[PDB]
Amino acid sequence: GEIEFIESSKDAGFPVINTPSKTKLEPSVFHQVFEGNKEPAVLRSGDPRLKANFEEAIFSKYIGNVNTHVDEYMLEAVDHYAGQLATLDISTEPMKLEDAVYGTEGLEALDLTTSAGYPYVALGIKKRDILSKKTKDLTKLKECMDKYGLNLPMVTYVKDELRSIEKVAKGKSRLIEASSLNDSVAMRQTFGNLYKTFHLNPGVVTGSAVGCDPDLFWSKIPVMLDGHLIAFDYSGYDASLSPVWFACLKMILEKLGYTHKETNYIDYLCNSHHLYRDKHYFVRGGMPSGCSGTSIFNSMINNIIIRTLMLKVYKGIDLDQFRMIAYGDDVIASYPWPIDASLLAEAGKGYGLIMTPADKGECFNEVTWTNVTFLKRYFRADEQYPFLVHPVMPMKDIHESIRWTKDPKNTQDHVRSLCLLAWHNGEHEYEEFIRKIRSVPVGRCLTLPAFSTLRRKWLDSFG
RNA sequence: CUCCAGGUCUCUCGUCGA
RNA sequence: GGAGA
Ligand SMILES: Nc1ccn([C@H]2CC[C@@H](COP(=O)(O)OP(=O)(O)OP(=O)(O)O)O2)c(=O)n1
């Protein structure tokens, strides 16, 4: 990922974009009961907690690119992953517009509560001015698409969210890229059946966890990844993808039946253009976080990436015995033999990728089923039914969430949802949690689910 | 006097119906 | 800046 060019938006006929600088996160009634290290992310240059240049820091994610060709490893990598995807009958036929916009089995409708992006964001137009789920109208949509076209700039905002205290101090707030309604629709039309087949089939064939429910799915995972575990973390994956990985992705899209016409939408992702406040700029490489397809294409690329590193580092390796599940940058995998992920990291570095030891730390340790995480959840088998596995979100991360709110009107929903995460920590931990919640006047006013009821419904789901 | 801040997945709750 | 009660 690299910013090639910056220009004034006026110069390029673009309006200045209103980008919020005030967080919506307030300390909650539970802010004191529990301990936490996160505060809301820095959103402006005048933040008193800033110990570094803000605008320098938020964009620092664009580490650079590496100029390499699609090498013999990538190519093999692609043919292998493609051969899996071929077993699924991914239709390259464009999705019916009513389905691409207002949802179908395997693909939910557009988020109508979010920005419509450029140009509408500066015309003061909301998604709901153009769409209604209730009416399923496409009239105003086609109109707007005719008028404004495709490949519009993506609008860059800072994400309102909690960050570690060093990420607050270092200004490493996160950027997202608001994709225009038009582009989201066009991509969903073009790639809807791919999205759908992916969501309806998470596992070791797609190599994707997208569409799974950790409650039900954690039990399936150790069966699928029966070998020795492989797991690492990425630093700024999305921003680290050089163009060659996109070339790889286009090539696998081509294998699947996609025309050069349709693969060209990948070009709008790799080579993208953005609005940020009063500037218009160009990024070469990097997956733009916020485009349509970001989870699916990030994941497909990860399947190509890890396959490549293996084929490269361990020359003569049998990928028919390799198994991986990716969720964007997040990956859990296994191979029948011990693989040194520090070496896969060294290789990764040569392709622009920064891979680090899993779940923080400074050794590429053994990855056991004990310490491995996926989607931030640990794996624990039931003590009573050892083939059912618990997705275990650390209580410390649940704690971080409850200590804040964006609106106390939601405290009941918020806490209930937190409960459905916490209980997989066990009865001891859940009741301590329910106690600490109850240790505060407002906590005594909430309907909390009983552990016994949670465990019951869970066991009941496997039926 | 409010609103402006992306893609998605999962779950949950609210309302309305068979 | 724009949209609205
Ligand atoms: N609002 C968000 C937050 C995250 N993500 C996706 C894109 C990248 C992926 C990883 O994000 P995190 O791991 O949660 O961020 P981090 O580990 O703190 O920072 P980094 O991406 O540098 O590892 O999640 C997203 O699409 N939208």
Residue numbers in the entry: 1 to 463
What did the published study say regarding this structure?
The replication of positive-strand RNA viruses relies on virally encoded RNA-dependent RNA polymerases (RdRPs) that are capable of rapid and processive synthesis of the 7–14 kilobase viral genomes. To examine this in further detail and to validate the polymerase–RNA interactions seen in the initial poliovirus EC structures, we here present nine new coxsackievirus, rhinovirus, and poliovirus elongation complex structures at resolutions ranging from 2.1 to 2.9 Å. All the complexes feature an upstream RNA duplex that is pinched between the pinky finger and thumb domains such that the RNA exit channel is opened by ≈4 Å as compared to the polymerase alone structures. All of the complexes show the open conformation for the active site wherein the β-strands of motifs A and C are not hydrogen bonded together to fully form the RMM-fold that is commonly utilized by polymerase active sites.
Soaking the CV_r2 crystals with CTP results in cracking and a low resolution dataset (≈3.4 Å) that is not of sufficient quality to elucidate structural details, but soaking with 2′,3′-dideoxy-CTP (ddCTP) leads to a 2.7 Å resolution structure (CV_r2+1) reflecting one translocation event and a second ddCTP bound in the active site. This complex is stalled at the pre-catalysis state 2 of the catalytic cycle because the primer no longer has a reactive 3′-hydroxyl group following the first ddCTP incorporation event. The two polymerase molecules at opposite ends of the dumbbell remain essentially fixed and the translocation is accommodated by “peeling” nucleotides away from the end of the duplexes at the RNA-RNA junction so that they become disordered in solvent channels and are no longer resolved in the structure. There are minor perturbations at the end of the RNA helices as new non-canonical base stacking and hydrogen bonding interactions are formed by the nucleotides that have now been translocated into the junction regions. 3500 K composite SA-omit maps contoured at 1.5 σ are shown for the CV_r2 complexes where soaking with 2′,3′-ddCTP results in one incorporation and translocation event and the binding of a second ddCTP in the active site. In contrast, the coxsackievirus 3Dpol CV_r2 lattice accommodated one translocation event upon 2′,3′-ddCTP addition by keeping the two ECs within a dumbbell pair essentially fixed while unraveling the ends of the two RNA duplexes at the junction point.
